[PDB]
Amino acid sequence: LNLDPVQLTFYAGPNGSQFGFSLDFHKDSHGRVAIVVGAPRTLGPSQEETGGVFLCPWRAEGGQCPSLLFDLRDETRNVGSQTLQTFKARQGLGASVVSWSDVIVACAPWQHWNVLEKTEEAEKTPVGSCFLAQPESGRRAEYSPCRGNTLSRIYVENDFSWDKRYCEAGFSSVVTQAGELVLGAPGGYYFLGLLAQAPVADIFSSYRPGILLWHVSSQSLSFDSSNPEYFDGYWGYSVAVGEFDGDLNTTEYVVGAPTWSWTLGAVEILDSYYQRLHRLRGEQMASYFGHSVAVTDVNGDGRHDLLVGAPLYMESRLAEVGRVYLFLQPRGPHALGAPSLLLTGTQLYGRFGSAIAPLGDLDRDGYNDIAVAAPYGGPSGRGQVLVFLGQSEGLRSRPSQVLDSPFPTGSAFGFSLRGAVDIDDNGYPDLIVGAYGANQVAVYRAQPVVKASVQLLVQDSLNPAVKSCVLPQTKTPVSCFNIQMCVGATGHNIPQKLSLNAELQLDRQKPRQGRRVLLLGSQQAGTTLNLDLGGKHSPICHTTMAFLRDEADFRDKLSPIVLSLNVSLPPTMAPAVVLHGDTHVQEQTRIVLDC
Amino acid sequence: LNLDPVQLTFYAGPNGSQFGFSLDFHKDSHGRVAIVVGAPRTLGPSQEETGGVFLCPWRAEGGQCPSLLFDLRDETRNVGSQTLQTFKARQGLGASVVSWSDVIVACAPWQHWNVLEKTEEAEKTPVGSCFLAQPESGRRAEYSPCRGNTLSRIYVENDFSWDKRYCEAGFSSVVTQAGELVLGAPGGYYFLGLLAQAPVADIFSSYRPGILLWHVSSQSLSFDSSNPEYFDGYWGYSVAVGEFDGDLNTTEYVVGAPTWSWTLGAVEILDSYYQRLHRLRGEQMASYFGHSVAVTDVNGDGRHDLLVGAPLYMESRADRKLAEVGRVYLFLQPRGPHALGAPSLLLTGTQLYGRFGSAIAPLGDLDRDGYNDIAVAAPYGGPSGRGQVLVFLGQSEGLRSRPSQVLDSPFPTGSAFGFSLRGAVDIDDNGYPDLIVGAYGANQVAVYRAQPVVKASVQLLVQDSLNPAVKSCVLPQTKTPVSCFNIQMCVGATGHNIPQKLSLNAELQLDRQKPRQGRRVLLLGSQQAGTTLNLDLGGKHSPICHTTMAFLRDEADFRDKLSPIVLSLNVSLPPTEAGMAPAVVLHGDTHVQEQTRIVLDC
Ligand SMILES: *[C@@H]1O[C@H](CO)[C@@H](O)[C@H](O)[C@H]1NC(C)=O
Ligand SMILES: *[C@@H]1O[C@H](CO)[C@@H](O)[C@H](O)[C@H]1NC(C)=O
Ligand SMILES: [Ca+2]
Ligand SMILES: [Ca+2]
Ligand SMILES: [Ca+2]
Ligand SMILES: [Ca+2]
Ligand SMILES: [Ca+2]
Ligand SMILES: [Ca+2]
Ligand SMILES: [Ca+2]
Ligand SMILES: [Ca+2]
């Protein structure tokens, strides 16, 4: 709602693009936050297809960020017969970035790995990897469960089972609250999908430079499945962490399979033991249900809620426009299955739902908020971010704000969206929009929100011929009533330069020269006053006095008086304020005399 | 707790005018708050003590104030045979000022009134008169419920039954939320005392300038009692309103009778029909149990609680058998309303002849923690006897038994600092209720502003027990290896209206039990086991935690391997005394200890 569109933070990257495929907020232990962006198609050791990650300090003007190296070299180790080796060709370092407690985990899902066992070989297959690093410490603990030495003949022998040659671990990187790192591998089990879990502390403990194999304590890998629906399931395409079970103190992983059950799609909730507590499938085939998955409690009830993206949805306008499915967390026995809000974009081929970013209390509204992105939406397919507030009792169905791509067509503005981290540390979380091949990363800063609570004090009714008030000049006896207005500013971090303007309307329904009551001071049927609330918490109530003419004067006495007070922000750069809540009170006064 | 004692506002009246005897907060139509101060001995137009009320607008420096021009003039109106007279000489206009909505009720209890019929009369007795005003419109009105025209001999003929000649109505004035003015006349019904309650709108709409004896049609008065206990009860010395019977439609009055049942003292809680719901007897005779009464929900359970004051309570010390200090009783209302019984808390003063409990002011939520705080004033307490005010914070069970803050008189001795108290109103509009204390001896009022309360939080994490020499990260500036680990402490500062310059200080003491310079655990850097560093939180919802590398001495080097390794994290405000007064109050947990041990084979 309060995300500043007119001013944005622009971060540049390599001319080879991909700067913005994935990104996250690196929360420093000191309390600072900086944006870490993976560019999975930067230059290699010698102009090679590789990845790469940049670390941008949080700023406003922006610029060329420094680069954080993880691993770019074709290693080769001779374990007896097996001369195993790694290949950086199109590794994609930066396709998944997640940060936690001074550690950054950035993945290269398409990194290759071949083991030469004399004549036979393991084939140069994309096992993928995800490299961990504490930039302050400098320690690098690369993690790659799918790296192995089992030669291809063994795979071919029995049933091509328990394979990890092309798992592509790290297609989606997330980290729990405790620091446990979770990685997706869509290609695991012969292009079926597996997951990896390992403590970052344990990963750093068990890692040894040079050697290209380990087990790293009790790292938890997903179970291989022979179910036909899982074939080419593409599990671990997108992952997130949130609390969903009946017990606390445990972190669940939500994983998306956009091709589950013959491109139908699914999303699953897993514990650390991978018990599959809940699984919700898609509705439209080839709609890519699960491309991006987000976890946040926008309802404000505390219990986390689920958002699932289907950018390839074909709306029954059969127009290819994505859709975000919302799932509030209920208190039923087997609840959470039925979706509640189905948000759908407008621009054709917009891919509405490629990036769902939790935002938390974006506008100090008391409920969490979200930002969905359609990378090819908008007027001319540029791509647009749709901010949806909590609003309680569900989610804001309408876009509280629409952020337009300032990038040319095809930049896919809005592929990776992250929020839920107050970058301004002002109770107002910000948003970051990165896009694959964008070459630029945009950051939206939220602005203070002012809720208004408005009340009126007007006499309910009176005799038009009371004749108690006295006109100054003419000295005529007239009836009159007490008109007062009190508007107060609620919310957090309200700016002290507030200049709210209140406009009063007496007999609003009646037109001009059809009006009945009329102000003494200004001789007008309505005025605006600077009812500024800046610099104080108490409401301002400056009254007025409008006279009511004699019976014989007018004839609109049969019409009851309408007293509508409407408060609006001043019209006079960036407003830095968003009026919300009650802003128009129309308490009424009727005319009562005999009939 | 957070009431600033350094920067005070001083509002002055005329010399010897008793400016500050009673006071209340008047809210202007625009929401601007002003103070109504009674000065019950201000010089009248004819150089005589009559009374007066000042309307002090809120400022920073303070000073002189304008006064509400009432009608200070004796009145004489002959209604045919009789001759009604009102004498406004030493009437005490300002002895009880209470502001409700846009009206101010300033009562002169000692205004005299006579009815001259031929030779006879009704005796020139003090009936009292409250003066209602609307300073934004000039609408003046008067209310004298106890005025009568019955000749003196009639009461003698009927045993002084329903004798309302000595009411001094306005001795204690309150206004309910529904706009009903309730006056306690301690001297009504021949000093038994009564309550006179009438709607303010009816008071304004039944007053005609010139008529002295009229009758408000909707007013209600108490019942004269033949029970010997009530005699000379002064029933109406102090009066307050609150909810005590269940139904929120009915409003109940709490009325003090400080000399009920032969100076024993009592407080009666009774509904609008003056049916006694409950009676709270005194504890010690001549203690004036009922001198001050306040109603507020200190414990926050949603039910109003009662605060009684006995300024002349003589406590039973071990050394002194009976010493006059004063005592405030706290009664907590439970469910099942007609069960409020034994007192829940018994606060007692310290200074002799300090009159602890002469004023009980509900402060609202001064600390902003969901519980109601009060102020009890001893006008002659304090080591020098010049006057003290004690702030008591509310909690789940009763309220704090010790004064969170103590305010001392800035005025010379005998100023009666604390006689009049009034609070629970944000005067400067900074989100925190303020307090106004009236020292009529010095003819001044002190305004205390509540500075913001910074609620702190501390979380010092030490990962686990460690081995003496793990031979990890080397000792600083040496290739010599030692055992190293991380110390991380997150400190947060949450509060309302906190300034942008807040910067706490974290004292990190490494095994404070051991003497410094040779502690078992030092830092991997400067090696100083005690490091106090500033951590700024000037508008940061995210606690900031600068991790530190810490070194552990050799197993042979440190010989006490059995003593617990206890790290100390202390949070303190910076030395703001160098500049102006401390702008914040760092209430809350600011000091924690975290203990670990020495592990082996790790
Ligand atoms: C989580 O809370 C505490 C702290 O870790 C722990 O002792 C407790 O067993 C946990 N609760 C669960 C697992 O339900
Ligand atoms: C209080 O008064 C309201 C008037 O609207 C009434 O509806 C309600 O029943 C009353 N409650 C009682 C008498 O307990
Ligand atoms: Ca859980
Ligand atoms: Ca929920
Ligand atoms: Ca919000
Ligand atoms: Ca922000
Ligand atoms: Ca009641
Ligand atoms: Ca209570
Ligand atoms: Ca409190
Ligand atoms: Ca204040």
From Swiss-Prot, chain A:
Binding locations of Ca(2+) 4: 422, 424, 426, 428, 430
Annotated effect of mutating residue 345 to D: In GT1; uncertain significance
Keyword line: Calcium, Cell adhesion, Cleavage on pair of basic residues, Disease variant, Disulfide bond, Glycoprotein, Integrin, Membrane, Metal-binding, Pyrrolidone carboxylic acid, Receptor, Repeat, Signal, Transmembrane, Transmembrane helix
Disulfide bond sites: 56-65, 107-130, 146-167, 469-480, 486-541
FG-GAP repeats: 4-65, 79-142, 156-207, 220-274, 275-336, 338-397, 400-461
Cellular localisation: Membrane
Binding sites annotated in the UniProt record for Ca(2+) 3: 361, 363, 365, 367, 369
Extracellular side: 1-595
Positions contributing to Ca(2+) 1 binding: 243, 245, 247, 250, 252
Glycosylation sites: 15, 249, 566
Role this protein plays: Integrin alpha-IIb/beta-3 is a receptor for fibronectin, fibrinogen, plasminogen, prothrombin, thrombospondin and vitronectin. It recognizes the sequence R-G-D in a wide array of ligands. It recognizes the sequence H-H-L-G-G-G-A-K-Q-A-G-D-V in fibrinogen gamma chain. Following activation integrin alpha-IIb/beta-3 brings about platelet/platelet interaction through binding of soluble fibrinogen. This step leads to rapid platelet aggregation which physically plugs ruptured endothelial cell surface.
Family: Belongs to the integrin alpha chain family.
Disease: Glanzmann thrombasthenia 1: A form of Glanzmann thrombasthenia, a disorder characterized by failure of platelet aggregation, absent or diminished clot retraction, and mucocutaneous bleeding of mild-to-moderate severity. Glanzmann thrombasthenia has been classified into clinical types I and II. In type I, platelets show absence of glycoprotein IIb-IIIa complexes at their surface and lack fibrinogen and clot retraction capability. Bleeding disorder, platelet-type, 16: An autosomal dominant form of congenital macrothrombocytopenia associated with platelet anisocytosis. It is a disorder of platelet production. Affected individuals may have no or only mildly increased bleeding tendency. In vitro studies show mild platelet functional abnormalities.
Protein name: Integrin alpha-IIb
Organism: Homo sapiens
Name of the coding gene: ITGA2B
Shown stretch of the complete protein: 32 to 633 of 1039
